[PDB]
């Protein structure tokens, strides 16, 4: 039906500051039935100084900051043309280049003055601007502390705050600078984590969204139309989605509106006017989020795609410090930890059978999680390490399989252990369901 395929977008207005910190807001935003939530006038309700994220202020703060530019052909939000301009296509490719905030700002500003749409046919979209530097963006980041706990960049209830190190763009803030038509290709978030997006303005963003439930159908369209779902750049053809009985949420994000994207929600975005957007990810400690995160973590492994969130590392840290009261979530984490212990044990036994030494490395403060140099899989605890350079400057971490796959096998490879069996066992036994 036409009505069901065009469902109303979940919306909230906060009449006061008290409403923003209400438990009702959390359960609404995280409800699996709500794939996306727009909070109207959130900035004003919480008195957020969005002027700190204005183009003028950003240029003053760091004019030489790196801006990743995406050159694009401008086209209506419901269109993506082939080279002949006679049919709709899924792939939406863009050329990548680099510039500065100051230089993109001038393009953004001049372009705005040209119209008394912009840049004619071809436009540039300033993406992936890094606001992780605490000293450089102090007033900007401090301003975001006015948000309720579950939406903050850092909180005890956010899985990404238990990683122990920086994951660029997930537990640090990214800035987008846009002109009309600036297009954000379709995707789910890294490891199906939730996301927060605030429109700074002055212009609007147009949003499109599909519930996580339909993601495999979206992936099959991408495969049918010759583009990588997880890693490629694509723009859904809306008629294809409606022809497959897939409801599409459509709404406008006006200046000061916060968009909350729930776990696994497929979404694509286009700027209607000139605007800046700020964004980051959040991983609420719930069974719904954890399940979706683990299954993308595994699916990533099947498709040889790096999981940007090291879910095994995160699950252990969470287990070590956070009390989980939900039985369903506890079961999932407890199982993940047990599987990890068994996996580590199997590796140690095989290494000891082969007569291969294992040195205890230990962990240090602010140490990153390790990934395989070849296949990009998370390498937890047992590290197969080699020296690429003649000196001890360049160390490469490999997984068991890739280490074994080397021409000389494990010769030259030093095997390290970051957590002893007893460390994991004692952390595991300490992890119990909260009352
Ligand atoms: O991912 C991005 C940056 C897209 C940059 C890009 C990459 C590849 C091709 C064109 C543009 N942006 C968003 C993601 N999710 C929600 C909203 C946005 C946004 O642009 O406000
Ligand atoms: Co997104
Ligand atoms: Mg991306
Ligand atoms: Mg599912
Ligand atoms: Zn590997």
From Swiss-Prot:
Protein name per its UniProtKB record: Lysine-specific demethylase 6B
Subunit structure as annotated in this protein's UniProt entry: Interacts with TLE1. Component of the MLL4 complex, at least composed of KMT2B/MLL4, ASH2L, RBBP5, WDR5, and KDM6B. Interacts with TBX21, SMARCA4, SMARCC1 and SMARCC2.
Family recorded in the similarity comment: Belongs to the UTX family.
Disease: Stolerman neurodevelopmental syndrome: An autosomal dominant disorder characterized by global developmental delay, variable intellectual disability, poor language acquisition, and dysmorphic facial features including a prominent nasal bridge and coarse features. Some patients manifest autism spectrum disorder. Musculoskeletal features may be present and include widened and thickened hands and fingers, joint hypermobility, clinodactyly of the fifth fingers, and toe syndactyly.
Compartments it resides in: Nucleus
Induction field: By 12-O-tetradecanoylphorbol-13-acetate (TPA) in myeloid leukemia cells.
JmjC domain span: 136-299
Residue numbers binding Fe cation: 187, 189, 267
Residue positions binding Zn(2+): 372, 375, 399, 402
Superkingdom per UniProt: Eukaryota
Function summary: Histone demethylase that specifically demethylates 'Lys-27' of histone H3, thereby playing a central role in histone code. Demethylates trimethylated and dimethylated H3 'Lys-27'. Plays a central role in regulation of posterior development, by regulating HOX gene expression. Involved in inflammatory response by participating in macrophage differentiation in case of inflammation by regulating gene expression and macrophage differentiation.
């Amino acid at each position: 039906p036409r009505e069901k395929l065009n469902p109303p977008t979940p919306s909230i207005y906060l009449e006061s500051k008290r409403d923003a910190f209400s438990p009702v807001l959390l359960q609404f935003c995280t409800d699996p039935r709500n794939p996306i939530t727009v909070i109207r006038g959130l900035a004003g309700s919480l008195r957020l100084n969005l002027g700190l994220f204005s183009t003028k202020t950003l240029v003053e703060a760091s004019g030489e900051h790196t801006v990743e530019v995406r050159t694009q052909v401008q086209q209506p939000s419901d269109e993506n043309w082939d080279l002949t301009g006679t049919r709709q296509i899924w792939p939406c490719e863009s050329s990548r280049s680099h510039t500065t905030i100051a230089k993109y700002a001038q393009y953004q500003a001049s372009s705005f003055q040209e119209s008394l749409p912009k840049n004619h046919h071809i436009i540039k979209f300033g993406t992936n601007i890094d606001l992780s530097d605490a000293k450089r963006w102090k007033p900007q980041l401090q301003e975001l502390l006015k948000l309720p706990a579950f939406m903050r960049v850092t909180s005890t209830g956010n899985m990404l705050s238990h990683v122990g190190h920086t994951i660029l763009g997930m537990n640090t803030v990214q800035l987008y600078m846009k002109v009309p038509g600036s297009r954000t290709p379709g995707h789910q978030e890294n490891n199906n984590f939730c996301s927060v997006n605030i429109n700074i303005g002055p212009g609007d963003c147009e949003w499109f969204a599909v519930h996580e439930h339909y993601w495999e159908t979206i992936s099959a369209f991408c495969d049918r139309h010759g583009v990588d779902y997880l890693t490629g750049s694509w723009w859904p053809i809306l008629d294809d989605l409606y022809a497959s009985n897939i409801p599409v949420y459509r709404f406008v994000q006006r200046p000061g509106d916060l968009v909350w994207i729930n776990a696994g929600t497929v979404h694509w975005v286009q700027a209607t006017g000139w605007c800046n957007n700020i964004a980051w990810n959040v991983g609420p400690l719930t069974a719904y989020q954890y399940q979706l995160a683990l299954e993308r973590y595994e699916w990533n492994e099947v498709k040889n795609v790096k999981s940007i969130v090291p879910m095994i590392h995160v699950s252990w840290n969470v287990a070590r410090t956070v009390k989980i009261s939900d039985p369903d979530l506890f079961k999932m984490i407890k199982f993940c930890l047990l599987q990890s212990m068994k996996h580590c044990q199997v590796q140690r036994e095989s290494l000891v059978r082969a007569g291969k030494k294992i040195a205890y490395q230990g962990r240090v403060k602010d140490e990153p999680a390790y990934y395989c140099n070849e296949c990009d899989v998370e390498v937890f605890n047992i590290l197969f390490v080699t020296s690429e350079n003649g000196s001890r400057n360049t160390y490469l971490v490999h997984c068991e399989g890739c280490a074994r796959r080397r021409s000389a096998g494990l010769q030259g490879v030093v095997v390290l252990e970051q957590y002893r069996t007893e460390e994991l066992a004692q952390a595991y036994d300490a992890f119990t369901l909260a009352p």
